[PDB]
Amino acid sequence: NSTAELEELLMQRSLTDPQLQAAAAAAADFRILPDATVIKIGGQSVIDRGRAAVYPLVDEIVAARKNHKLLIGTGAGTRARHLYSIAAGLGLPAGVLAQLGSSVADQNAAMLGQLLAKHGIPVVVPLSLAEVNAVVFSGMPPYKLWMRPAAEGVIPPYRTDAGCFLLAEQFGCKQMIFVKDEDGLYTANPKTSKDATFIPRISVDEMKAKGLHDSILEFPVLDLLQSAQHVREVQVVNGLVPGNLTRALAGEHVGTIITAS
């Protein structure tokens, strides 16, 4: 297209106009933090398990910021499940539940941040990443009462996997790593199935075709991934295995790589 045609369309058409949408799609693509990696530290899968899970990951974070710029987001976990149960039983809508879950992810960010404070790493970005090479943040999206509900039920569909993914995408980060409590994706939930098979690499479409739309990641994240401009694959790893985060940051193919296409 052309800058003049885009500006003409932007003034004279609705933003819904397909011709304007197509001209905007031709715009240049700036990555804000291209050398950073976003990592999600799971709530139920890691932080809720306490020292045995968190302390080794603290050690890995401290070791990694030496050669890797990190944005470290927290999940929510069992306390958010409790709040969702109370509020859902009262008939409260997804937008109210969203704010409740955010508070739990914030508690987890505070706990992790306090263990990293002596290493210079704050809870929050540009200045911190330039100096101490890492920050900690709460993973819940800020949608609050404006959370889009799911098709069924009042549980917010965009929780901390989505929040972390969207930050990686909108900052143009080079990599997104989800740190959970299983080695990766399996053909069935490994906690409730005896003979589930490990999947090292899969596309979103293949996951859907295998019935795995809502397995180790919030299924809305898989659709966000297919729409993403910058982060076109993600890696899921087991944070309970010593060194697994370090190895993933070093390029080792631990865990499962899920690709947009």
Binding site: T3, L6, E7, L10, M11, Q12, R13, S14, L15, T16, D17, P18, L20, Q21, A24, A25, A27, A28, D29, F30, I32, L90, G91, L92, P93, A94, G95, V96, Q99, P141, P142, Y143, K144, L145, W146, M147, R148, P149, A150, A151, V154, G163, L166, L167, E169, Q170, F171, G172, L224, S227, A228, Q229, H230
Partner: protein, 246 residues
């Protein structure tokens, strides 16, 4: 299904298009006079859209290459400015602009203190806007609908610079082709390709809505249409959301 409760069942939500505000006093002063007369009749949350200044900030930001999560808050700012302007015109009636956190958590007390408040119609998606388009998808119509439906409000009325929805842009290149639509469903609109006076994302949030059954788009440039719409009179385009009544 066991649909959620209505938090503020007595609330009427009115979204004012940013392009209406862009017309300046010639459009704003009649609208302010109409709103003044509505304050004793309804409990109002008045939400403003963004308009042409957001098109300018998109022109600059897209030229700088910025992603859709950067453009979202930049547009939302223009809707906030429209809200501050409109609230100032109603200050002598006790109306003020209220910020998003206050809308989300303290609206009930504010509407106990006064008959109406003004806020920004954009939702606070910020840098967590969804990718796909380089234009932020969750804009003023979508934000206003999400809020009205979350609250279980009695209605949402969208105040436009046109009579409603046509089969083509009535100000565009196919303008002689454009036929007025008195009524439509969101699902029918979503299956059409072509421009609309409402966000495409509005149609998506209508599909997951739990309370609001219909939204009317009316021409704010015609005095009396907002008042009629708030009484349920059919003076623009009715959009059926697909929420089924009792």
């Amino acid at each position: 299904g066991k649909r959620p409760i209505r938090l503020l069942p007595w609330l009427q939500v009115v979204k004012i298009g940013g392009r209406v505000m862009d017309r300046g006093a010639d459009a704003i002063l009649p609208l302010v006079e109409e709103l003044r007369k509505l304050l004793p009749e309804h409990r109002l949350l008045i939400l403003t859209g963004a308009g042409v200044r957001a098109r300018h900030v998109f022109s600059v930001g897209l030229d700088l290459g910025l992603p859709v999560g950067s453009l979202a808050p930049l547009a939302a700012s223009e809707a906030g400015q429209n809200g501050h302007i409109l609230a100032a015109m109603l200050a002598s009636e006790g109306v003020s602009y209220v910020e998003h956190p206050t809308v989300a958590d303290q609206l009930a007390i504010h509407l106990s203190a006064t008959r109406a408040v003004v806020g920004s119609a954009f939702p606070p998606y910020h840098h967590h806007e969804f990718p796909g388009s380089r234009i932020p998808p969750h804009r003023a119509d979508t934000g206003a609908f999400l809020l009205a439906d979350a609250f279980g409000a009695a209605g949402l009325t969208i105040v436009e610079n046109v009579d409603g929805i046509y089969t083509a842009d009535p100000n565009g290149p196919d303008r002689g082709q454009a036929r007025f639509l008195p009524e439509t469903s969101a699902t029918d609109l979503a299956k059409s390709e072509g421009p609309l006076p409402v966000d495409r994302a509005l149609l998506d949030v209508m599909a997951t809505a739990r309370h609001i059954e219909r939204v009317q788009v009316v021409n704010g440039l015609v005095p009396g249409r907002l008042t009629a719409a708030l009484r349920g009179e059919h003076v623009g385009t009715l959009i059926r959301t697909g929420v089924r009544p009792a």
